[PDB]
Design a protein around this ligand. Structure first.
Ligand code: HEM
Ligand SMILES: Cc1ccc(Cl)cc1
Length: 432
């Protein structure tokens, strides 16, 4: 019944707790082993049930009529992306009483979620992505040509991994190549709201609501950019993903409001590349630690999808979304009360020893690989098949050219409790 101990709670709730993976994963492990379903009561945050167990993540996510993302019929009464209390107060001041700062899928509950998701559901199915595989492969091969030309010593993140997924999504999306640097900068602002090295110059960095102010400022910049793109594609439809979203109409023949397009565009322009970049960089870091795995996958390229799956499980770059209980609910001997918030810890589910043998080991021979890096339930990642295709294609093209990865300097993570992973991985590569 007791609250989670304060230092374990702070490790997971506070963005600074995520600066180093070792203490963070040890806190997730302490909970799974000693307090798998407890309430974190961190000063400055709402109380949060920390959902650390794989089975519990599925139990919550498969019951959206009980555990809402956006607050159910009181739309925007829950923030699906954990802000501190001061930050939610800033957003309620800006929006006028609620937290629905994007019309993107994470903010929506059924049935609205279902209607909006159906705009793009088919586009993102694996069979409908096959038509992009050759373009993706040409993009990978161009990126690998630049890697070979630049020599063996680089930051495998900022000087390699970041560019391929960004170019892929901007090409599919229809954003011109010259706009990639702006999209990259706004993505760093968006996922860096609590990172000391990613602060915007136009917000008060030290204010209690700084992250929320940065989130809002970044969204306003994306809206200004995507307003021009929506109007452009409505006036002159093209055969690109921007057009599918920009021209989408509801069951009465009316365009969805423009902010629904903007919400798709924010999600695709941020999570659509950053997560894949993180997983690719994390894969390279794991091949440096486990050179026998690199040798084995160069020996059998059909192991590449297994390597992608184990990279996704280990890196798990999307750390959480929040839910709110719409009714009291008993789980694992605990009484969740109506109105209580939950934090879904996908990275912790991915280390649950009840599901994975030697869960901290990098083991590509987990078949099936039961990871939950894409979440579960109706909100399960829409982009998962595009991410798996891009990582497969890049590894098919890159690994033949790599004999060895060495980490030659200190890795750096984004300091975030939300969408994290490496921002720097200094390497020495041995090529062929
Ligand atoms: C390695 C790559 C990725 C990982 C690990 C990842 C992970 C996730 C996770 C854990 C969620 C939350 C699921 C839940 O609430 O149960 C999610 C949601 C989402 N992701 Fe992905 N993602 C990746 C790639 C992508 C890509 C490539 C796109 C788009 C092109 C994308 C778009 C989205 C969107 C729109 C949502 C919200 C879905 C909803 O709330 O219904 N993601 N992702
Ligand atoms: C993973 C993720 C999906 C959608 C948004 Cl808006 C942000 C992050």
């Amino acid at each position: 019944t007791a609250a989670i101990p304060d230092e374990i709670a702070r490790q997971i709730v506070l963005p600074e707790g995520h600066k180093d993976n070792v203490p963070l994963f040890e806190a997730y492990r302490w909970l799974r082993e000693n307090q798998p379903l407890g309430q974190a009561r961190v000063e400055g945050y709402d109380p949060l049930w920390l959902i650390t167990k794989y089975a519990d993540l599925m139990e919550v996510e498969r019951q959206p009529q009980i555990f809402a993302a956006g607050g159910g019929e009181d739309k925007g009464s829950n923030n699906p992306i954990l802000a501190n209390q001061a930050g939610d107060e800033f957003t309620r001041q800006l929006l006028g009483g609620n937290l629905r700062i994007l019309d993107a899928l994470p903010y929506l509950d059924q049935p609205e979620h279902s209607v909006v998701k159906d705009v793009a559901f088919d586009w993102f199915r694996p069979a409908n992505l096959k038509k992009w595989e050759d373009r993706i492969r040409e993009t990978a091969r161009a990126s690998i040509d630049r890697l070979l030309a630049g020599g063996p010593d680089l930051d495998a993140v900022q000087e390699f991994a970041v560019f391929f997924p960004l170019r892929v999504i901007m090409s599919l999306f229809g954003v011109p190549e010259e706009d990639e640097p702006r999209m990259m900068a706004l993505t760093q602002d968006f996922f860096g709201v609590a990172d000391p090295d990613a602060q915007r110059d136009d917000i008060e960095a030290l204010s209690p609501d700084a992250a929320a102010q940065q989130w809002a400022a970044t969204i306003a910049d994306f809206y200004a950019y995507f307003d021009v793109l929506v109007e452009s594609r409505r006036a002159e439809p093209r055969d690109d993903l921007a057009t599918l979203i920009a021209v989408a109409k509801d069951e009465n023949g009316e365009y969805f409001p423009k902010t629904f397009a903007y919400g798709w565009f924010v999600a695709i322009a941020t999570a659509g590349h950053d997560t894949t970049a993180s997983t690719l960089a994390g894969c390279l870091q794991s091949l440096a630690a486990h050179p026998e795995v690199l040798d084995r996958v160069k020996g059998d390229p059909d192991l590449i999808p297994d390597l992608v799956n184990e990279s996704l499980r280990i890196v798990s770059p999307v750390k959480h979304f929040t839910r709110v209980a719409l009714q009291d609910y008993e789980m694992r001997g605990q009484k969740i009360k109506a109105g209580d918030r939950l934090m879904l810890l996908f990275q912790s589910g991915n280390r649950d020893a009840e599901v994975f043998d030697r869960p901290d080991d990098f083991d590509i021979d987990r078949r099936p690989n039961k990871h939950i890096a894409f979440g579960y339930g109706p909100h399960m990642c829409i982009g998962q098949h595009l991410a798996k295709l891009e990582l497969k294609v890049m590894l098919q093209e890159l690994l033949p050219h790599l004999e060895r990865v060495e980490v030659s300097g200190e890795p750096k993570l984004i300091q975030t409790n939300f969408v994290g992973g490496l921002r720097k991985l200094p390497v020495h590569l041995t090529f062929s």
